[PDB]
Design a protein around this ligand. Structure first.
Ligand SMILES: [Mg+2]
Ligand SMILES: [Mg+2]
Ligand SMILES: [Mg+2]
Ligand SMILES: [Mg+2]
Ligand SMILES: [Mg+2]
Ligand SMILES: [Mg+2]
Ligand SMILES: [Mg+2]
Ligand SMILES: [Mg+2]
Ligand SMILES: [Mg+2]
Ligand SMILES: [Mg+2]
Ligand SMILES: [Mg+2]
Ligand SMILES: [Mg+2]
Length: 1045
């Protein structure tokens, strides 16, 4: 075999070295035209060392100072020799490096650097750039099955090889020869199996390893793909992504096993999947975290799993896995201890995993095993009744002075039957809220569970300074030795807070670093409860407390429980970070990587996971199985579900239905951009599967605008619920046509956002739901309404009240704005889709305009169950994300008074009326899409409609089929989202009756002032909601037949 070696050419010296007040940049012409090469140079805040850089982007005259055969270079004048400079390397006005370069004079003290076109790295010399160009670079080779490598670098090259080194890096030796062992590769054609697994790589050149290759040998260390010419000079070399071959080699054998510290009465078996590790030891720790044993584990050859079996005396023991494993990011054989990705119990702050048997009676509240789901979820009609209250453990109880102090912010607050919060939830349940959805209660990373390291706003400012050095070094340091609590300081800061002095958020942003508050979309361990919500985060105690909460919700409050789950990302990856678990144990397998660099992708926010890989799909299903069986969770909401393959979500659902036949799955099925890799679990792709998705259609039509809005657009973009068209504010330009389009989306959503539902649009045209456009997408997408989750408020983005406050006309008074809140919620609560709402919408909840409140603390997330106010106007929201909105906030904020007890009680009554109406007839919750189509229609449609009046009919008459409600032959839902009184004339001669529920509320009803006249006409006041019924006589009547279209 020919030996592969570096180019036998001289390594380039420097063309020139920077002198005083100069920088030098070489463009190293690695590719075997210099006059058109030029630099764009500019000073900004962070880099400002350039002397008089040319201002005009179009000026291409900063051409090379000199050049030679190794390329051109530039000498650049500076005003100082410290700091950095901004550089874009161009040909003409086109970038030759896609990255905007930053040349650091601290990383390159001689200020003489080198770059290569198409390469974002900055080198200290042309020699370094040259050796990098002919060395291991990037990671664009993919070893996808036993014998197949996909690699663009190997195309049309005679020598293509897979070099490998068990304990070091593949590199050229002192002679310049690559002397590590290798396997010869040959051109081949990709198999269909591989093409279906990796469609985004299917067009890459394919190469074949010998059928007798010892894969386990190569996978234990570094592998590098190397291409060369016939003479044997290296052409390119790159690192190898191995997840595909790991699945092809090990996944079936590994899928057949179970993982974690599996404790039963006979003993314990520990198992961890680590098919590339060179060694795995099980380290057992005492309660005081001293090592008491380190056990070499036993590797199984078929699966690449490691196991160790011991006695039941290991119950309660702490443990970690000591890994010896090559990590391709660092290119080192790393040595570190890692917690179990299958941990079911943890020490404080997740430092050690703990052996537990979740079946143990000591970890269960009394009567746990007999806990039943209070609301059915079997049929589609059952599911359609789902009415969700999306809640957070701290948002519930952090402020409730009637919850015992030691339970504030804890799972166990739900057991405080004497508290305002629990009594309020109990009344919401009695009125028709059916499900609590919990924000992250698995083990999150972003709260410190060591209570000594945390300071909350109810505690002395002196404590804050002790735990938070940023506060102690800030402009607020003078409060350190005050006798005030943090919340007392924040309160005194309100009066002088404004857009010109956002001092409340200035202090609160520092507080956020060390408080107990986070939404928790930051997974540390997927299958252990979060510790900070327990009264004792050390060891197994949180398990029973979590179960006590679940039992309280289901048995005592009468609501089902949904968990938010976050399998689309990990909190961290790589070999170093505290919270990198999976990516330490099987590096490069559990994360989705860029096809060229091997970098962990971050489209989700964080460290994107790879649910398309078999062992991560298994981890997800196994995790859901524990939450289902051991924690009696009734449904799951998948965060960023579009990052998951449709096939993976469906397989998980099949697996969980074997454990709980009525489990319900839904998620955020927004487009994830992953369709090139697999069919994504999106709104459209899930049609007909029974997996629900949040609908953005009715949401945005009723709220107005969308999550990206900033500045004046927040006010201009009124929604149906805030008077689009009919009650314009001073900035909007919405036309009547635009407002009527939003009403088309709203009606479609009230009918379950079905693709095939037939309506009359704003122009009088007959349209299917899929033909009503939503921001350039088919609006209706579902097969059944139980596939659609409607909402107008959620933890993310502004609260409904804050949206109404941005959008409402100046003349809309406070009482009108409360009715706008209720009218907005009526479109959800009286619609056929599953109903979902944010905790506190019934209390006009505000976040003081905060759009994204995940780390905005108790202050901005406060819900006041004592009913004094709605948390509006408590300071400008965080400047980093809402500073662009300070101008519009200042202009709208004080239009009307802040809600107090009167408005909060009024809104709670409106809310409970809506949820009671939703459950008052099976007709609101038909479940089956074909049944919706046969029974649901709309009036007041087309070009002659009265804008803002939504009139929905639901048929129970003979033309619909059977009577599903023995009391009525039909229902009319009329939502008059407008400042005028409206009269309905199309039910003349039929004698409708107002719902008994609305009658019983009298002048506190949303239908207060509705008139049903002798001629059958119905008059609705401004901003009202009426549910009217056709009473059923001795036999089923004519009803309200759907009109043929
Ligand atoms: Mg310029
Ligand atoms: Mg240098
Ligand atoms: Mg080929
Ligand atoms: Mg007990
Ligand atoms: Mg935690
Ligand atoms: Mg103020
Ligand atoms: Mg925080
Ligand atoms: Mg405590
Ligand atoms: Mg991609
Ligand atoms: Mg589109
Ligand atoms: Mg409140
Ligand atoms: Mg009937």
């Amino acid at each position: 075999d020919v030996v592969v070696r570096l180019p036998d050419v001289a390594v380039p010296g420097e063309a020139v070295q920077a002198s005083a007040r100069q920088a030098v940049i070489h463009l190293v012409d690695i590719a075997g035209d210099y006059a058109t090469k030029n630099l764009y140079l500019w000073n900004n805040e962070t880099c400002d060392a350039l002397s008089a850089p040319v201002a005009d982007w179009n000026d291409v005259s900063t051409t090379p100072t000199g050049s030679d055969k190794y390329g051109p270079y530039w000498v650049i004048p500076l005003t100082k020799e410290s700091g950095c400079i901004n550089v874009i390397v161009r040909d003409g006005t086109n970038k030759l490096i896609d990255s905007d370069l930053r040349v650091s004079f601290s990383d390159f003290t001689d200020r003489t650097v080198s770059v290569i076109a198409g390469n974002s790295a900055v080198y200290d010399s042309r020699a370094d750039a040259f050796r990098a160009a002919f060395g291991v670079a990037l990671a664009d080779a993919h070893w996808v099955d036993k014998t197949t490598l996909l690699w663009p670098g190997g195309e049309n090259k005679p020598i293509v090889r897979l070099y490998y080194s068990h304990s070091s890096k593949v590199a050229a030796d002192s002679n310049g020869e690559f002397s590590d062992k290798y396997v010869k590769l040959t051109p081949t054609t990709v198999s269909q199996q591989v093409s279906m697994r990796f469609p985004h790589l299917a067009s890459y050149p394919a190469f074949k390893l010998p059928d007798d290759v010892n894969v386990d040998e190569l996978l234990q260390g570094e592998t590098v793909a190397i291409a060369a010419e016939s003479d044997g000079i290296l052409s390119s070399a790159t690192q190898v992504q191995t997840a595909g071959v790991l699945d092809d080699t090990y996944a079936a054998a590994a899928e057949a096993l179970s993982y974690g510290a599996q404790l039963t009465d006979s003993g314990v078996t520990f198992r961890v999947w680590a098919p590339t590790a060179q060694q795995v030891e099980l380290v057992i720790y005492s309660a005081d975290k001293k090592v008491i044993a380190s056990h070499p584990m036993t590797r199984d050859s078929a699966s690449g799993a490691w196991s160790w079996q011991g006695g039941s005396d290991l119950k309660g023991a702490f443990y970690r896995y000591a890994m010896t494993v090559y990590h391709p990011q660092s290119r080192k054989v790393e040595q570190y201890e890692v917690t179990d990705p299958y941990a079911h119990s943890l020490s404080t702050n997740s430092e050690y995993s703990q052996v537990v048997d979740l079946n143990d009676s000591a970890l269960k509240p009394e009567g746990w095993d007999g806990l039943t789901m209070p609301h059915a979820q079997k049929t589609k009609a059952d599911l359609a009744k789902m009415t969700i209250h999306e809640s957070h453990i701290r948002d519930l109880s952090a402020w409730d002075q009637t919850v015992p102090a030691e339970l504030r912010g804890k799972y166990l607050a739900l057991t405080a039957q004497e508290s305002n919060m629990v009594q309020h939830l109990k009344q919401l349940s009695a009125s028709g809220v059916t499900h609590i959805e919990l924000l992250p209660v698995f083990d999150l990373a972003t709260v410190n569970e060591f209570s000594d390291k945390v300071a909350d706003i109810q505690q002395p400012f002196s404590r804050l300074c002790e735990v938070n050095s940023a506060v102690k070094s800030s402009e607020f340091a003078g409060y350190c030795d005050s006798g005030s609590t943090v919340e007392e300081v924040l309160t005194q800061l309100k009066q002088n807070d404004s857009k010109d002095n956002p001092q409340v958020q200035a202090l609160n942003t520092l507080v956020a670093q060390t408080d107990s508050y986070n939404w928790g979309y930051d997974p540390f361990h997927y299958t252990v409860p979060e510790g900070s919500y327990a009264t004792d985060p050390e060891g197994t105690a949180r398990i029973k407390e979590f179960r006590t909460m679940i039992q309280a919700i289901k048995q005592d409050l009468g609501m089902n429980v949904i968990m938010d789950v976050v399998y689309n990302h990990t909190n961290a990856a790589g070999p170093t970070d505290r919270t990198s678990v999976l990516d330490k144990i099987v590096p490069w397998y559990y994360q989705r990587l860029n096809e060229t660099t091997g970098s962990v992708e971050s489209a989700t926010c964080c460290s994107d996971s790879a649910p398309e890989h078999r062992m991560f799909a298994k981890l997800i299903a196994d995790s859901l199985a524990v939450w289902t069986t051991d924690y009696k969770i009734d449904g799951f909401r998948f965060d960023l579900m579009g990052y998951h393959p449709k096939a993976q979500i469906l397989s998980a659902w099949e697996r969980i239905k074997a454990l709980n036949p009525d489990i319900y799955f839904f998620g955020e099925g927004w487009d994830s951009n992953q369709s090139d890799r697999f069919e994504i679990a999106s709104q459209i792709n899930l049609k007909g599967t029974g997996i629900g998705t949040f609908s953005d259609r009715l949401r945005d039509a009723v709220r107005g605008g969308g999550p990206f809005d900033s500045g004046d657009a927040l006010r201009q973009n009124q929604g149906v619920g805030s008077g689009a068209g009919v009650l314009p504010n001073e900035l909007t330009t919405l036309s009547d046509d635009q407002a009527r389009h939003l009403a088309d989306l709203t009606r479609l959503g009230m009918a379950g956002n079905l693709a095939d539902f037939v309506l009359i649009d704003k122009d009088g045209a007959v349209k299917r739901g899929s033909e009503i456009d939503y921001n350039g997408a088919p609006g209706g997408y579902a097969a059944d309404p139980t596939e659609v989750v409607n909402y107008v408020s959620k933890h993310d983005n502004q609260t409904l009240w804050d949206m109404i406050s941005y959008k409402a006309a100046q003349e809309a008074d406070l009482d009108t704005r409360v009715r706008m809140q209720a009218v907005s919620l009526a479109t959800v609560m009286l619609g056929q889709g599953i109903a979902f709402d944010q905790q506190g919408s019934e209390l006009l909840r505000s976040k003081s305009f905060t759009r994204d409140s995940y780390d905005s603390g108790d202050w901005f997330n406060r819900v006041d169950y004592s009913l004094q106010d709605n948390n509006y106007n408590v300071g400008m929201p965080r400047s980093s994300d809402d500073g662009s909105n300070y101008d519009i906030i200042a202009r709208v904020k004080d239009a009307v008074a802040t809600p107090g007890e009167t408005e909060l009680k009024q809104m709670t009554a409106f809310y409970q009326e809506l949820t009671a109406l939703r459950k008052s007839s099976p007709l609101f919750t038909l479940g089956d899409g074909a049944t919706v189509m046969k029974r649901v229609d709309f009036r007041n449609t087309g070009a002659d409609q009265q804008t803002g009046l939504l009139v929905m009919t639901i048929d129970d008459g003979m033309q619909a089929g059977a009577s599903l409600d023995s009391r009525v032959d039909g229902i009319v839902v009329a939502i008059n989202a407008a400042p005028e009184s409206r009269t309905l004339q199309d039910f003349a001669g039929t004698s409708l009756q107002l719902s008994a529920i609305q009658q019983a509320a009298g002048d506190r009803s949303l239908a207060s002032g509705v008139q049903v006249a002798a001629d059958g006409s119905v008059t609705l006041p401004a901003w009202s909601v009426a549910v009217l019924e056709l009473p059923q006589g001795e036999s089923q009547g004519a009803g309200l037949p759907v009109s043929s279209k």
